[PDB]
Amino acid sequence: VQLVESGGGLAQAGGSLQLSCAASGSTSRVNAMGWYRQTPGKERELVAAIDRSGATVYSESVRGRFTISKNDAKNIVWLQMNNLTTEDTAVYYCRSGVLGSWGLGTQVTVSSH
């Protein structure tokens, strides 16, 4: 199992960022994939998850603004972070349903106007 996150950046409130998660190696079609995020002092929290059928779940903080999707060809899970708010500033991590190791994640900062 190997998780590789790509993307990130400094965004403005109302802007957009696209993160990707690659699950090379093991059976990348056995369980779900999820995006998590963590802020200083706080606990890591689920953002969104997708299963092999394409079904999705979202945290209420991001429902309607973020979209999770999968490219079964390239074996990539995307987090489409739209309508960004300062609340979205965090390190973002992707994880499969078989738990295990965390990747290094990638950092997102959202600045107010």
XYZ file of all heavy atoms in Angstrom:
839
model
N 0.835 -1.195 0.000
C 0.000 0.000 0.000
C 0.873 1.251 0.000
O 1.853 1.333 0.741
C -0.961 0.006 1.202
C -1.967 1.142 1.077
C -1.670 -1.335 1.321
N 0.518 2.222 -0.840
C 1.258 3.475 -0.922
C 0.305 4.595 -1.309
O -0.397 4.494 -2.319
C 2.402 3.386 -1.937
C 3.213 4.670 -2.054
C 4.135 4.676 -3.258
O 4.116 3.755 -4.076
N 4.948 5.721 -3.375
N 0.295 5.659 -0.508
C -0.553 6.822 -0.730
C 0.319 8.015 -1.089
O 1.251 8.350 -0.350
C -1.382 7.138 0.517
C -2.231 5.997 1.082
C -2.565 6.249 2.550
C -3.493 5.810 0.257
N 0.016 8.653 -2.217
C 0.746 9.829 -2.682
C -0.256 10.948 -2.931
O -1.148 10.808 -3.776
C 1.554 9.537 -3.956
C 2.173 10.816 -4.492
C 2.631 8.498 -3.671
N -0.108 12.054 -2.205
C -0.948 13.230 -2.380
C -0.238 14.251 -3.263
O 0.983 14.405 -3.190
C -1.293 13.859 -1.028
C -2.200 13.002 -0.145
C -1.459 12.270 0.969
O -0.223 12.111 0.880
O -2.120 11.854 1.946
N -1.010 14.947 -4.097
C -0.476 15.974 -4.978
C -1.392 17.185 -4.933
O -2.589 17.064 -4.663
C -0.346 15.479 -6.424
O 0.491 14.339 -6.506
N -0.823 18.352 -5.205
C -1.581 19.585 -5.187
C -1.471 20.288 -3.850
O -0.729 19.885 -2.949
N -2.234 21.368 -3.732
C -2.232 22.238 -2.576
C -1.996 23.665 -3.001
O -1.979 23.990 -4.192
N -1.832 24.545 -2.029
C -1.453 25.908 -2.337
C -2.086 26.896 -1.381
O -2.781 26.533 -0.432
N -1.791 28.171 -1.642
C -2.404 29.293 -0.942
C -3.535 29.819 -1.813
O -3.304 30.239 -2.955
C -1.390 30.401 -0.655
C -1.951 31.684 -0.024
C -2.435 31.402 1.382
C -0.907 32.786 -0.008
N -4.750 29.783 -1.284
C -5.933 30.176 -2.027
C -6.618 31.341 -1.327
O -6.297 31.695 -0.192
C -6.898 28.996 -2.179
N -7.569 31.953 -2.019
C -8.392 32.983 -1.411
C -9.791 32.435 -1.185
O -10.238 31.524 -1.890
C -8.453 34.237 -2.283
C -9.062 34.009 -3.647
C -8.717 35.118 -4.615
O -8.058 34.887 -5.624
N -9.150 36.335 -4.304
N -10.468 32.982 -0.177
C -11.864 32.640 0.051
C -12.658 32.813 -1.236
O -12.544 33.837 -1.917
C -12.445 33.515 1.162
N -13.435 31.785 -1.586
C -14.181 31.765 -2.825
C -13.459 31.132 -3.995
O -14.094 30.868 -5.024
N -12.157 30.875 -3.871
C -11.386 30.250 -4.923
C -11.435 28.732 -4.854
O -12.191 28.135 -4.085
N -10.589 28.102 -5.672
C -10.632 26.658 -5.870
C -9.231 26.063 -5.891
O -8.277 26.685 -6.368
C -11.341 26.292 -7.182
O -12.701 26.706 -7.176
N -9.135 24.831 -5.396
C -7.931 24.015 -5.473
C -8.342 22.585 -5.785
O -9.431 22.149 -5.404
C -7.131 24.044 -4.165
C -6.407 25.334 -3.800
C -5.946 25.280 -2.350
C -5.221 25.535 -4.730
N -7.470 21.855 -6.481
C -7.703 20.445 -6.787
C -6.558 19.611 -6.232
O -5.403 19.800 -6.628
C -7.837 20.213 -8.296
C -9.022 20.897 -8.937
C -8.726 22.329 -9.325
O -7.739 22.604 -10.001
N -9.578 23.250 -8.894
N -6.879 18.684 -5.330
C -5.916 17.731 -4.797
C -6.153 16.361 -5.413
O -7.292 15.986 -5.699
C -6.026 17.605 -3.272
C -6.094 18.884 -2.442
C -6.026 18.556 -0.956
C -4.978 19.831 -2.831
N -5.076 15.592 -5.574
C -5.193 14.236 -6.088
C -4.503 13.254 -5.154
O -3.551 13.595 -4.443
C -4.615 14.100 -7.507
O -3.249 14.458 -7.553
N -5.013 12.028 -5.148
C -4.469 10.948 -4.336
C -4.278 9.734 -5.228
O -5.228 9.282 -5.873
C -5.397 10.615 -3.167
S -4.877 9.200 -2.176
N -3.055 9.218 -5.269
C -2.710 8.057 -6.078
C -2.479 6.861 -5.169
O -1.753 6.961 -4.174
C -1.467 8.326 -6.927
N -3.100 5.738 -5.512
C -2.989 4.500 -4.750
C -2.337 3.442 -5.635
O -2.991 2.494 -6.079
C -4.363 4.049 -4.246
N -1.046 3.611 -5.898
C -0.308 2.640 -6.686
C 0.021 1.412 -5.843
O 0.021 1.452 -4.609
C 0.980 3.255 -7.238
O 0.704 4.345 -8.099
N 0.299 0.307 -6.529
C 0.741 -0.896 -5.855
C -0.350 -1.913 -5.597
O -0.721 -2.674 -6.494
N -0.874 -1.932 -4.373
C -1.824 -2.955 -3.961
C -3.161 -2.767 -4.679
O -3.352 -1.848 -5.481
C -2.009 -2.924 -2.445
O -0.775 -3.112 -1.774
N -4.103 -3.663 -4.376
C -5.422 -3.645 -4.997
C -6.146 -2.336 -4.712
O -6.756 -2.166 -3.651
C -6.262 -4.831 -4.515
O -7.653 -4.540 -4.699
C -5.988 -5.131 -3.043
N -6.089 -1.405 -5.661
C -6.707 -0.099 -5.482
C -8.182 -0.138 -5.859
O -8.744 0.864 -6.312
C -5.973 0.953 -6.313
O -5.947 0.586 -7.682
N -8.820 -1.293 -5.677
C -10.238 -1.430 -5.977
C -10.925 -2.369 -4.992
O -11.888 -3.056 -5.352
C -10.452 -1.908 -7.419
C -9.444 -2.942 -7.899
C -9.836 -4.350 -7.485
N -8.670 -5.154 -7.143
C -7.891 -5.758 -8.029
N -8.121 -5.666 -9.328
N -6.854 -6.472 -7.600
N -10.447 -2.404 -3.749
C -10.991 -3.299 -2.744
C -11.804 -2.563 -1.681
O -12.769 -3.129 -1.154
C -9.859 -4.128 -2.096
C -8.850 -3.221 -1.400
C -10.420 -5.166 -1.135
N -11.463 -1.318 -1.364
C -12.163 -0.594 -0.318
C -12.242 0.876 -0.710
O -11.804 1.280 -1.790
C -11.474 -0.790 1.036
C -12.457 -0.812 2.191
O -13.375 0.003 2.250
N -12.277 -1.757 3.109
N -12.805 1.676 0.186
C -13.010 3.083 -0.099
C -11.690 3.848 -0.028
O -10.655 3.336 0.407
C -14.024 3.677 0.876
N -11.741 5.093 -0.489
C -10.681 6.072 -0.306
C -11.303 7.291 0.350
O -12.431 7.667 0.024
C -10.039 6.470 -1.636
C -9.405 5.324 -2.394
S -7.936 4.694 -1.562
C -6.867 6.120 -1.632
N -10.584 7.901 1.281
C -11.080 9.081 1.956
C -10.049 10.187 1.993
O -8.844 9.948 1.938
N -10.550 11.412 2.080
C -9.730 12.578 2.363
C -10.001 13.037 3.788
O -11.161 13.115 4.213
C -10.013 13.708 1.376
C -9.283 13.563 0.076
C -9.777 13.055 -1.095
C -7.923 13.930 -0.188
N -8.803 13.086 -2.069
C -7.658 13.618 -1.536
C -6.902 14.491 0.589
C -6.416 13.856 -2.130
C -5.666 14.728 -0.004
C -5.438 14.412 -1.349
N -8.930 13.318 4.521
C -8.969 13.818 5.884
C -8.184 15.120 5.939
O -7.371 15.409 5.058
C -8.362 12.813 6.876
C -9.057 11.469 6.886
C -8.883 10.569 5.842
C -9.876 11.099 7.941
C -9.515 9.345 5.839
C -10.510 9.870 7.951
C -10.327 9.000 6.895
O -10.955 7.775 6.895
N -8.418 15.900 6.987
C -7.640 17.110 7.193
C -7.409 17.331 8.676
O -8.187 16.878 9.521
C -8.320 18.336 6.600
C -9.590 18.724 7.314
C -10.288 19.800 6.522
N -11.485 20.287 7.190
C -12.332 21.141 6.637
N -12.139 21.607 5.413
N -13.396 21.537 7.326
N -6.326 18.035 8.985
C -5.981 18.308 10.369
C -5.466 19.731 10.497
O -4.758 20.227 9.617
C -4.931 17.328 10.891
C -4.817 17.318 12.410
C -3.956 16.184 12.916
O -3.233 15.551 12.150
N -4.031 15.917 14.216
N -5.817 20.370 11.604
C -5.380 21.710 11.950
C -4.585 21.662 13.251
O -4.689 20.693 14.014
C -6.586 22.651 12.090
O -7.502 22.120 13.055
C -7.299 22.790 10.755
N -3.759 22.676 13.525
C -2.919 22.627 14.729
C -3.750 22.509 15.997
O -4.759 23.196 16.171
C -2.152 23.952 14.677
C -2.109 24.295 13.229
C -3.425 23.833 12.673
N -3.316 21.613 16.883
C -4.007 21.350 18.125
C -5.255 20.504 18.005
O -5.664 19.888 18.997
N -5.869 20.442 16.829
C -7.122 19.725 16.659
C -6.877 18.291 16.196
O -5.753 17.881 15.897
C -8.026 20.453 15.666
C -8.600 21.759 16.184
C -9.486 21.526 17.398
C -10.581 20.508 17.103
N -11.402 20.890 15.922
N -7.962 17.527 16.136
C -7.894 16.135 15.731
C -8.187 15.994 14.242
O -8.952 16.770 13.662
C -8.878 15.290 16.542
C -8.662 13.802 16.369
C -7.187 13.446 16.347
O -6.490 13.742 17.341
O -6.721 12.892 15.326
N -7.555 14.995 13.628
C -7.773 14.711 12.216
C -9.222 14.298 11.985
O -9.775 13.487 12.734
C -6.812 13.613 11.769
C -6.723 13.406 10.283
C -5.435 12.681 9.937
N -4.272 13.422 10.409
C -3.014 13.050 10.219
N -2.712 11.940 9.572
N -2.033 13.815 10.690
N -9.841 14.872 10.955
C -11.266 14.707 10.710
C -11.504 14.291 9.265
O -10.766 14.684 8.358
C -12.027 16.003 11.009
C -11.585 17.170 10.135
C -12.179 18.495 10.559
O -12.765 18.566 11.660
O -12.054 19.470 9.786
N -12.541 13.488 9.059
C -12.924 13.104 7.708
C -13.480 14.302 6.945
O -14.207 15.133 7.498
C -13.959 11.978 7.748
C -14.456 11.436 6.404
C -13.320 10.807 5.608
C -15.573 10.424 6.612
N -13.128 14.391 5.666
C -13.652 15.407 4.763
C -14.641 14.804 3.775
O -15.762 15.292 3.627
C -12.507 16.139 4.024
C -13.064 17.219 3.125
C -11.536 16.740 5.021
N -14.244 13.729 3.100
C -15.082 13.074 2.106
C -14.482 11.711 1.797
O -13.280 11.493 1.960
C -15.201 13.905 0.826
N -15.333 10.801 1.337
C -14.904 9.451 1.007
C -15.693 8.963 -0.194
O -16.807 9.425 -0.444
C -15.099 8.496 2.186
N -15.103 8.029 -0.937
C -15.725 7.465 -2.130
C -15.442 5.969 -2.155
O -14.361 5.529 -1.755
C -15.215 8.171 -3.410
C -15.934 7.651 -4.663
C -13.699 8.051 -3.536
C -15.677 8.505 -5.895
N -16.419 5.176 -2.588
C -16.195 3.739 -2.671
C -16.060 3.328 -4.134
O -16.138 4.154 -5.046
C -17.288 2.952 -1.930
C -18.666 3.053 -2.571
O -18.801 3.553 -3.709
O -19.639 2.612 -1.911
N -15.846 2.028 -4.352
C -15.557 1.557 -5.702
C -16.724 1.791 -6.651
O -16.517 1.959 -7.859
C -15.180 0.080 -5.671
C -13.693 -0.152 -5.520
C -12.931 0.612 -6.593
N -12.338 1.844 -6.085
C -11.607 2.676 -6.814
N -11.355 2.438 -8.091
N -11.116 3.776 -6.246
N -17.949 1.815 -6.130
C -19.122 2.063 -6.955
C -19.273 3.524 -7.351
O -20.147 3.837 -8.165
C -20.384 1.614 -6.220
O -20.641 2.460 -5.111
N -18.457 4.421 -6.802
C -18.619 5.839 -7.041
C -19.498 6.561 -6.044
O -19.667 7.781 -6.167
N -20.076 5.851 -5.076
C -20.855 6.501 -4.032
C -19.944 7.349 -3.152
O -18.770 7.034 -2.958
C -21.588 5.463 -3.183
N -20.496 8.440 -2.621
C -19.698 9.408 -1.884
C -20.401 9.829 -0.600
O -21.634 9.850 -0.523
C -19.423 10.653 -2.729
O -20.672 11.233 -3.115
C -18.633 10.294 -3.977
N -19.594 10.180 0.404
C -20.058 10.798 1.641
C -19.224 12.045 1.898
O -18.053 12.120 1.515
C -19.984 9.838 2.854
C -20.957 8.687 2.680
C -18.569 9.316 3.047
N -19.840 13.040 2.535
C -19.167 14.297 2.832
C -19.419 14.726 4.265
O -20.513 14.523 4.801
C -19.639 15.422 1.921
C -19.335 15.202 0.474
C -20.243 14.564 -0.350
C -18.131 15.616 -0.068
C -19.975 14.362 -1.679
C -17.849 15.414 -1.398
C -18.774 14.786 -2.199
O -18.509 14.578 -3.523
N -18.402 15.323 4.879
C -18.605 16.041 6.126
C -19.521 17.236 5.884
O -19.558 17.804 4.790
C -17.260 16.499 6.695
O -17.422 17.555 7.620
N -20.285 17.611 6.914
C -21.209 18.731 6.761
C -20.494 20.063 6.557
O -21.085 20.981 5.980
C -22.142 18.813 7.965
C -23.325 17.874 7.851
C -24.127 18.114 6.585
O -24.590 19.258 6.381
O -24.283 17.166 5.784
N -19.239 20.182 6.995
C -18.485 21.412 6.774
C -18.298 21.707 5.292
O -18.244 22.876 4.895
C -17.119 21.322 7.453
O -17.245 21.099 8.846
N -18.196 20.673 4.459
C -17.814 20.837 3.062
C -18.906 20.418 2.094
O -18.725 20.559 0.880
C -16.511 20.073 2.750
C -15.449 20.394 3.787
C -16.776 18.573 2.693
N -20.030 19.900 2.583
C -21.065 19.413 1.682
C -21.612 20.557 0.834
O -22.013 21.599 1.358
C -22.185 18.736 2.478
C -23.394 18.356 1.646
C -24.302 17.383 2.389
N -23.789 16.018 2.343
C -23.889 15.219 1.287
N -24.455 15.628 0.163
N -23.408 13.980 1.360
N -21.598 20.365 -0.487
C -22.000 21.362 -1.449
C -20.848 22.154 -2.040
O -20.966 22.661 -3.163
N -19.737 22.267 -1.313
C -18.570 23.016 -1.763
C -17.466 22.116 -2.292
O -16.878 22.412 -3.338
C -18.021 23.879 -0.622
C -19.048 24.810 -0.008
C -18.450 25.708 1.068
N -17.844 24.968 2.172
C -16.538 24.890 2.397
N -15.659 25.457 1.584
N -16.103 24.233 3.468
N -17.171 21.025 -1.594
C -16.176 20.063 -2.040
C -16.860 18.923 -2.782
O -17.992 18.547 -2.469
C -15.381 19.480 -0.868
C -14.442 20.451 -0.204
C -14.518 21.814 -0.445
C -13.474 19.987 0.667
C -13.649 22.689 0.174
C -12.603 20.861 1.291
C -12.691 22.208 1.044
N -16.153 18.367 -3.762
C -16.592 17.181 -4.483
C -15.442 16.188 -4.546
O -14.316 16.561 -4.888
C -17.056 17.531 -5.901
O -18.131 18.476 -5.835
C -17.529 16.287 -6.627
N -15.719 14.926 -4.232
C -14.731 13.864 -4.362
C -15.106 13.007 -5.567
O -16.286 12.719 -5.805
C -14.606 13.033 -3.067
C -13.398 12.099 -3.148
C -15.898 12.277 -2.770
C -13.083 11.362 -1.850
N -14.103 12.639 -6.357
C -14.345 11.861 -7.561
C -13.156 10.947 -7.810
O -12.082 11.121 -7.231
C -14.583 12.770 -8.769
O -13.399 13.468 -9.106
N -13.352 9.966 -8.683
C -12.300 8.999 -8.959
C -12.139 8.798 -10.458
O -13.114 8.816 -11.214
C -12.574 7.654 -8.269
C -13.729 6.851 -8.837
C -13.969 5.595 -8.007
C -14.863 4.603 -8.729
N -16.172 5.194 -9.106
N -10.896 8.623 -10.875
C -10.552 8.285 -12.252
C -10.013 6.861 -12.213
O -8.841 6.643 -11.900
C -9.533 9.268 -12.824
C -9.270 9.050 -14.304
O -9.428 7.945 -14.823
N -8.862 10.110 -14.992
N -10.880 5.892 -12.520
C -10.484 4.490 -12.466
C -9.422 4.145 -13.499
O -8.707 3.153 -13.325
C -11.709 3.594 -12.653
C -12.696 3.713 -11.507
O -12.278 3.535 -10.343
O -13.885 3.995 -11.769
N -9.297 4.936 -14.566
C -8.225 4.712 -15.528
C -6.867 5.027 -14.910
O -6.022 4.138 -14.748
C -8.462 5.554 -16.784
N -6.646 6.291 -14.541
C -5.379 6.699 -13.946
C -5.220 6.243 -12.500
O -4.131 6.410 -11.939
C -5.230 8.221 -14.021
C -5.070 8.765 -15.431
C -4.666 10.234 -15.413
C -4.389 10.758 -16.817
N -5.597 10.711 -17.689
N -6.264 5.674 -11.895
C -6.248 5.232 -10.499
C -5.964 6.408 -9.559
O -5.037 6.391 -8.746
C -5.239 4.096 -10.296
C -5.422 3.387 -8.974
O -6.543 3.237 -8.487
N -4.318 2.951 -8.378
N -6.796 7.440 -9.685
C -6.616 8.706 -8.985
C -7.933 9.093 -8.328
O -8.998 8.972 -8.942
C -6.154 9.821 -9.951
C -4.811 9.464 -10.579
C -6.054 11.153 -9.234
C -3.722 9.242 -9.568
N -7.864 9.560 -7.084
C -9.009 10.145 -6.396
C -8.757 11.640 -6.255
O -7.709 12.053 -5.744
C -9.252 9.495 -5.024
C -10.350 10.236 -4.282
C -9.615 8.026 -5.186
N -9.706 12.443 -6.719
C -9.608 13.898 -6.684
C -10.442 14.475 -5.551
O -11.576 14.046 -5.333
C -10.099 14.506 -7.997
C -9.195 14.291 -9.149
C -9.256 13.279 -10.060
C -8.092 15.118 -9.536
N -8.246 13.418 -10.986
C -7.523 14.544 -10.689
C -7.530 16.285 -9.017
C -6.417 15.097 -11.331
C -6.433 16.839 -9.657
C -5.889 16.245 -10.801
N -9.894 15.472 -4.852
C -10.688 16.337 -3.983
C -10.800 17.695 -4.674
O -9.808 18.424 -4.799
C -10.077 16.475 -2.589
C -10.961 17.231 -1.590
C -12.246 16.448 -1.312
C -10.206 17.514 -0.298
N -12.001 18.018 -5.146
C -12.269 19.309 -5.778
C -12.707 20.254 -4.669
O -13.835 20.177 -4.183
C -13.340 19.170 -6.855
C -13.102 17.993 -7.785
C -14.366 17.516 -8.476
O -14.603 16.310 -8.594
N -15.182 18.457 -8.939
N -11.811 21.138 -4.251
C -12.090 22.073 -3.166
C -12.526 23.389 -3.794
O -11.697 24.190 -4.225
C -10.869 22.255 -2.271
C -10.249 20.958 -1.779
S -8.650 21.263 -0.970
C -9.143 22.329 0.380
N -13.834 23.602 -3.853
C -14.413 24.809 -4.413
C -15.041 25.646 -3.307
O -15.268 25.168 -2.191
C -15.455 24.460 -5.478
C -14.849 23.727 -6.655
O -13.771 24.090 -7.137
N -15.526 22.679 -7.115
N -15.305 26.911 -3.635
C -15.922 27.859 -2.705
C -15.187 27.867 -1.366
O -15.785 27.734 -0.298
C -17.408 27.544 -2.509
C -18.162 27.417 -3.824
O -18.396 28.406 -4.515
N -18.565 26.195 -4.162
N -13.867 28.027 -1.436
C -13.021 27.856 -0.260
C -13.329 28.905 0.804
O -13.685 30.045 0.501
C -11.545 27.922 -0.667
C -11.032 26.661 -1.367
C -9.760 26.932 -2.149
C -10.801 25.550 -0.363
N -13.211 28.493 2.069
C -13.328 29.383 3.214
C -12.085 29.239 4.080
O -11.341 28.261 3.977
C -14.585 29.093 4.065
O -14.432 27.845 4.756
C -15.832 29.027 3.195
N -11.870 30.228 4.952
C -10.726 30.172 5.858
C -10.758 28.923 6.734
O -9.706 28.460 7.189
C -10.681 31.433 6.722
O -11.945 31.615 7.368
C -10.383 32.648 5.865
N -11.947 28.358 6.966
C -12.072 27.121 7.731
C -11.379 25.945 7.060
O -11.097 24.944 7.728
C -13.549 26.772 7.944
C -14.227 27.479 9.108
C -14.747 28.862 8.755
O -14.074 29.588 7.991
O -15.839 29.222 9.244
N -11.111 26.033 5.760
C -10.523 24.920 5.028
C -9.004 24.867 5.142
O -8.399 23.934 4.607
C -10.939 24.994 3.555
C -12.445 24.901 3.371
O -13.102 24.183 4.156
O -12.977 25.546 2.444
N -8.380 25.834 5.818
C -6.938 25.804 6.025
C -6.561 24.604 6.880
O -7.046 24.468 8.005
C -6.476 27.093 6.703
O -6.707 28.204 5.830
C -4.992 27.004 7.049
N -5.690 23.743 6.356
C -5.351 22.491 7.030
C -4.313 21.752 6.196
O -4.056 22.097 5.040
C -6.575 21.593 7.229
N -3.734 20.714 6.790
C -3.013 19.709 6.023
C -4.012 18.623 5.648
O -4.784 18.158 6.497
C -1.827 19.134 6.818
C -1.028 18.169 5.939
C -0.931 20.251 7.313
N -4.024 18.243 4.375
C -4.982 17.279 3.852
C -4.286 15.952 3.584
O -3.186 15.919 3.029
C -5.654 17.813 2.574
C -6.692 18.871 2.877
C -6.317 20.163 3.223
C -8.052 18.566 2.850
C -7.268 21.128 3.527
C -9.007 19.519 3.146
C -8.611 20.799 3.493
O -9.569 21.746 3.787
N -4.938 14.860 3.983
C -4.384 13.518 3.894
C -5.382 12.594 3.217
O -6.589 12.707 3.432
C -4.081 12.942 5.276
C -3.073 13.701 6.103
C -3.461 14.755 6.918
C -1.738 13.327 6.102
C -2.533 15.437 7.695
C -0.810 13.994 6.870
C -1.209 15.049 7.660
O -0.270 15.710 8.417
N -4.891 11.666 2.405
C -5.765 10.643 1.852
C -5.404 9.281 2.429
O -4.238 8.991 2.705
C -5.718 10.608 0.322
S -4.204 10.017 -0.445
N -6.429 8.453 2.614
C -6.302 7.184 3.316
C -7.295 6.204 2.718
O -8.399 6.595 2.336
C -6.558 7.359 4.823
C -5.683 6.494 5.725
C -6.504 5.479 6.507
N -6.944 5.971 7.807
C -6.358 5.671 8.960
N -5.272 4.916 9.011
N -6.880 6.134 10.093
N -6.903 4.937 2.635
C -7.839 3.934 2.156
C -8.609 3.339 3.330
O -8.246 3.507 4.495
C -7.122 2.836 1.372
O -6.780 1.749 2.205
N -9.693 2.635 3.005
C -10.537 2.034 4.024
C -9.878 0.931 4.822
O -10.421 0.536 5.860
N -8.725 0.435 4.377
C -8.033 -0.638 5.082
C -7.093 -0.022 6.113
O -6.186 -0.688 6.627
C -7.289 -1.555 4.094
C -6.985 -2.905 4.728
C -8.121 -1.745 2.837
N -7.316 1.249 6.426
C -6.599 1.986 7.483
C -5.100 1.909 7.182
O -4.697 1.978 6.010
C -7.004 1.462 8.850
C -8.168 2.186 9.538
C -9.502 1.866 8.870
C -8.211 1.865 11.028
N -4.255 1.774 8.199
C -2.831 1.662 7.976
C -2.109 2.992 7.973
O -2.490 3.924 8.688
N -1.065 3.089 7.158
C -0.182 4.242 7.202
C -0.864 5.481 6.643
O -1.763 5.405 5.800
C 1.095 3.967 6.409
O 1.762 2.818 6.893
N -0.425 6.634 7.131
C -0.762 7.905 6.519
C 0.345 8.315 5.561
O 1.523 8.026 5.786
C -0.946 8.991 7.575
C -2.107 8.773 8.476
C -2.091 8.191 9.710
C -3.465 9.146 8.223
N -3.360 8.175 10.241
C -4.221 8.756 9.346
C -4.116 9.771 7.154
C -5.594 8.973 9.432
C -5.483 9.983 7.243
C -6.205 9.584 8.371
N -0.044 8.988 4.483
C 0.917 9.655 3.637
C 1.410 10.930 4.288
O 1.046 11.280 5.409
N 2.268 11.644 3.563
C 2.780 12.902 4.084
C 1.771 14.035 3.986
O 1.958 15.068 4.637
C 4.063 13.291 3.354
C 5.254 12.426 3.756
C 6.491 12.828 2.971
C 5.492 12.546 5.258
N 0.717 13.871 3.196
C -0.283 14.912 3.060
C 0.232 16.094 2.255
O 1.357 16.113 1.761
N -0.627 17.103 2.125
C -0.229 18.345 1.478
C -0.972 19.495 2.145
O -2.064 19.316 2.690
C -0.488 18.296 -0.041
O -0.005 19.498 -0.657
C -1.973 18.122 -0.338
N -0.366 20.680 2.113
C -0.862 21.811 2.885
C -1.705 22.748 2.035
O -1.366 23.035 0.883
C 0.296 22.595 3.501
C -0.173 23.618 4.499
C 0.948 24.467 5.038
O 2.083 24.407 4.556
N 0.639 25.269 6.049
N -2.795 23.237 2.627
C -3.670 24.231 2.019
C -3.861 25.368 3.014
O -4.134 25.129 4.196
C -5.033 23.625 1.628
C -6.015 24.724 1.220
C -4.862 22.604 0.512
N -3.695 26.600 2.543
C -4.005 27.788 3.327
C -4.987 28.636 2.537
O -4.820 28.813 1.325
C -2.739 28.591 3.655
O -1.824 27.769 4.389
C -3.083 29.804 4.507
N -6.026 29.129 3.210
C -7.022 29.997 2.590
C -6.957 31.353 3.270
O -7.142 31.453 4.489
C -8.440 29.413 2.676
C -9.406 30.303 1.902
C -8.468 27.981 2.135
N -6.703 32.393 2.485
C -6.619 33.751 2.996
C -7.930 34.492 2.766
O -8.571 34.335 1.722
C -5.473 34.511 2.328
O -5.496 35.879 2.696
N -8.322 35.298 3.750
C -9.463 36.187 3.609
C -9.088 37.400 2.757
O -7.913 37.680 2.504
C -9.961 36.633 4.981
O -8.915 37.245 5.713
N -10.109 38.128 2.317
C -9.914 39.272 1.430
C -9.178 40.409 2.133
O -9.455 40.716 3.291
C -11.260 39.773 0.897
C -12.073 38.716 0.214
N -11.541 37.511 -0.195
C -13.384 38.682 -0.127
C -12.488 36.782 -0.759
N -13.615 37.469 -0.731
